[PDB]
Design a binder for this molecule. Sequence first.
Ligand code: NAG
Ligand code: NAG
Ligand code: NAG
Ligand code: NAG
Ligand code: NAG
Ligand code: NAG
Ligand code: NAG
Ligand code: NAG
Ligand code: NAG
Ligand code: NAG
Ligand code: NAG
Ligand code: NAG
Lengths: 135, 135, 135
Amino acid sequence: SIDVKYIGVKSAYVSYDVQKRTIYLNITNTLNITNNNYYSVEVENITAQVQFSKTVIGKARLNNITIIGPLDMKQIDYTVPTVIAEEMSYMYDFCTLISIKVHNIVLMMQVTVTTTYFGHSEQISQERYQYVDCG
Amino acid sequence: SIDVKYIGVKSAYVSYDVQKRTIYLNITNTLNITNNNYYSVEVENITAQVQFSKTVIGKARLNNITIIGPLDMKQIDYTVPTVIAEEMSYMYDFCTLISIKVHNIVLMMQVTVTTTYFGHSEQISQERYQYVDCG
Amino acid sequence: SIDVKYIGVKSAYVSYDVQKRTIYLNITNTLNITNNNYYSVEVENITAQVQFSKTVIGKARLNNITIIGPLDMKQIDYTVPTVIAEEMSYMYDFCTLISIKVHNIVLMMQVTVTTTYFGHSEQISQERYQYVDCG
Ligand SMILES: *[C@@H]1O[C@H](CO)[C@@H](O)[C@H](O)[C@H]1NC(C)=O
Ligand SMILES: *[C@@H]1O[C@H](CO)[C@@H](O)[C@H](O)[C@H]1NC(C)=O
Ligand SMILES: *[C@@H]1O[C@H](CO)[C@@H](O)[C@H](O)[C@H]1NC(C)=O
Ligand SMILES: *[C@@H]1O[C@H](CO)[C@@H](O)[C@H](O)[C@H]1NC(C)=O
Ligand SMILES: *[C@@H]1O[C@H](CO)[C@@H](O)[C@H](O)[C@H]1NC(C)=O
Ligand SMILES: *[C@@H]1O[C@H](CO)[C@@H](O)[C@H](O)[C@H]1NC(C)=O
Ligand SMILES: *[C@@H]1O[C@H](CO)[C@@H](O)[C@H](O)[C@H]1NC(C)=O
Ligand SMILES: *[C@@H]1O[C@H](CO)[C@@H](O)[C@H](O)[C@H]1NC(C)=O
Ligand SMILES: *[C@@H]1O[C@H](CO)[C@@H](O)[C@H](O)[C@H]1NC(C)=O
Ligand SMILES: *[C@@H]1O[C@H](CO)[C@@H](O)[C@H](O)[C@H]1NC(C)=O
Ligand SMILES: *[C@@H]1O[C@H](CO)[C@@H](O)[C@H](O)[C@H]1NC(C)=O
Ligand SMILES: *[C@@H]1O[C@H](CO)[C@@H](O)[C@H](O)[C@H]1NC(C)=O
């Protein structure tokens, strides 16, 4: 990337800013901007790019071959009992939460077994997480 | 990318901004912008790009071959009992939640077994997560 | 990257900023900006790039072959009993949470078994985590 910005509230290239209880009297503003942005970005010049994959087997014997790629999800148990009894009680559960593995962002890129590539790979993430607000 | 912006509330290239209880009297504004943006971005020049995949087998013997790619989802148990009894109670569940793996964003890109590629791969994510607001 | 910015509240290339209880009287502003930005960024010049993968087997004997890539998820147990009884009680659970492995951002890039590549790989993350706010 070139210019990544995280902004709290306000972005202003020029900000003539006024707020509460202000006497804005007798002001003279003269402003000139000559803004130039010039970009020559990610330019590629290749005369020759060769990509070659070759597998050769000559009368061989193969047995018990197992190939498993990344992210091998197997045989998991989740158990969350919630056994609640009462005897003459006043229950006040205002903001109570039960969350099993809640996901927000899952960006999977280049997850394979055999891979050959040429070039550029780029991932950008912005957010404002707030999980819980209870008053 | 070139220009990624996360903005809190306001973006303004020029902001003549006024708010509450303001006496905006006798103001003279003169403003000139000469804004130039020039882009030559991701330009490719290739004379020769070769992509070649070859598999050759000569009278070989193959047995018990298993190939499994990424993301192998198998044999999972989720158990969330919720056993609730009462005896003479006042229940007040105002903002109570039970969530099993709630997903927001799942961006899968290039998830295979065998892969060959040339070029550019790009992912951009913005959001404003707030899960729960209870008053 | 070139310019990564984390901003608290406000970003302003020029900020003529006024707030509460201000007497802005008799002000004369003269402002000139000649702003030039020149970028020649990630430019590649390759005459020859060769990528070659070759596997050759000559009448060999293969058995009990197991290949497993990264992220091998197997055989996990989670058990979170919640056994609650009462006898004549006043329950006040205002902001109480139970979270098992809640995920926000999972960026997976280049997770394979065999990999060959040429180029640029880039990941950018901004956020404002706040998990819980209870008043
Ligand atoms: C604002 O400017 C004018 C002209 O220059 C002047 O007559 C006036 O008195 C000024 N205002 C104040 C409050 O001085
Ligand atoms: C910008 O405008 C002001 C206004 O008078 C002038 O004096 C200045 O020469 C200008 N500059 C350019 C680069 O145009
Ligand atoms: C790519 O094009 C030609 C071929 O090599 C080269 O002369 C030129 O300078 C390159 N372009 C850039 C922007 O570098
Ligand atoms: C491995 O080979 C033996 C006998 O050759 C067979 O019993 C077994 O099932 C094989 N393994 C798998 C995972 O199939
Ligand atoms: C605003 O400007 C005019 C002309 O310059 C002037 O007559 C007037 O008095 C000014 N206002 C104030 C409040 O001074
Ligand atoms: C912009 O406008 C102002 C207004 O008077 C002028 O003085 C200045 O020369 C101008 N600049 C350009 C670059 O046009
Ligand atoms: C691509 O086109 C020709 C062929 O190589 C080259 O001369 C030129 O400079 C390249 N273009 C750019 C924008 O670099
Ligand atoms: C592996 O081979 C054995 C005997 O050759 C067979 O019993 C078994 O089922 C094979 N494995 C699989 C996964 O089929
Ligand atoms: C503001 O400027 C004008 C002209 O220069 C002047 O007459 C006036 O008295 C000034 N204001 C104050 C409060 O002095
Ligand atoms: C910018 O504007 C001011 C306004 O008078 C002028 O004096 C100065 O020469 C200008 N500079 C350029 C580079 O345009
Ligand atoms: C790439 O293009 C030609 C070929 O080598 C070279 O002369 C030129 O200087 C390069 N471009 C840049 C921007 O370096
Ligand atoms: C390894 O080989 C033995 C006998 O050759 C077989 O019993 C066993 O199942 C093999 N292992 C696997 C994981 O298949």
